[PDB]
């Protein structure tokens, strides 16, 4: 541990193009493992990791029926929120939810998540006490009052402390081996000439998993160059990730700069420099 189980929900109205797009995506430890999409040829919860293929038909039928119920509920709620905000009909709007649990290595709940957004802005969330709500505005206050009157927090807390934690335990047991996998980055430095006898040194990390990584450039043991260019970590398309970091240095000084690559897969951080052919 720690481990987490979270569902990311998206409902997008599209007047004139039929009923709203509706999707639910589940993650175990930030790895997608199940997905439902109303725009699939056959909308149904489907496994998104091979280890989920060990769940029998009852599981998929049950989860699919919940998704279909949630879909109908969010269809209503899109209309409701239009009313709360006195918005005109005919536009496309979005409700999103992040729902789930994080548990410690000892199996105890560390935190619960129930966060809503409307049109990409926070709307309502369950507080850390698992008992009260934070509403973002006067519209969300209406939902908050409905939920207080219905005892929704108590129902949700039962899910977060019970079902969510227990199913996470189940998923981890099936997916343990696969979830633990790491791929170490492979690194190299490239050299590019710039005007005024300057040089771009670019330190690449490729083929790594999971995405968390740190690249740094050092002159003389510092671990310290403030002004690098970095790109955001990006998916290679094969389940691994890429990143690079560059610095501009004077021609004739390239050999004094060192790139370090830090990743959980590595026995020790990588250290490399520009290797003149």
């Amino acid at each position: 541990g720690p481990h987490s189980l979270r569902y990311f929900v998206t409902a997008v109205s599209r007047p004139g193009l039929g009923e709203p797009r509706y999707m639910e995506v589940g993650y175990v430890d930030d790895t997608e493992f199940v997905r439902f999409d109303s725009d699939a040829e056959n909308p149904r919860y489907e496994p998104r990791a091979r280890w989920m293929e060990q769940e029998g038909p009852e599981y998929w039928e049950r989860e699919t029926q919940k998704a279909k119920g949630n879909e109908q509920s969010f269809r209503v709620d899109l209309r409701t929120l239009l009313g709360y905000y006195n918005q005109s009909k005919g536009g496309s709007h979005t409700i999103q939810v992040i729902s789930g649990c994080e548990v410690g290595s000892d199996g105890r709940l560390l935190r619960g998540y129930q966060q809503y957004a409307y049109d990409g802005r926070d709307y309502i969330a369950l507080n850390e006490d698992l008992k009260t709500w934070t509403a973002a505005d006067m519209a969300a206050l209406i939902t908050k009052h409905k939920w207080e009157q219905a005892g929704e927090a108590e129902r949700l807390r039962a899910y977060l402390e019970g079902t969510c934690v227990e199913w996470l335990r189940r998923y981890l047991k099936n997916g343990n081996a696969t979830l633990l996998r790491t791929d170490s980055p492979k690194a190299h430095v490239t050299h590019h000439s710039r005007p005024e006898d300057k040089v771009t040194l670019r330190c690449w990390a490729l083929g790594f998993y999971p995405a968390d990584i740190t690249l740094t450039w050092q002159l003389n043991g510092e671990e310290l160059i403030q002004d690098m260019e970095l790109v955001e970590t990006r998916p290679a398309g094969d389940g691994t990730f890429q990143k690079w970091a560059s610095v501009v240095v004077p021609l004739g000084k390239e050999q004094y700069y060192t790139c370090h690559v830090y990743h959980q897969g590595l026995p020790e951080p990588l250290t490399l420099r520009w290797e003149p052919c």
């Binding site: 998704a67 969010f74 929120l81 729902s99 409905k146 129902r155």
Partner: peptide
């Protein structure tokens, strides 16, 4: 297992 979400 997903939650059954509440009416807003």
């Amino acid at each position: 297992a997903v939650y059954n979400f509440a009416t807003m």
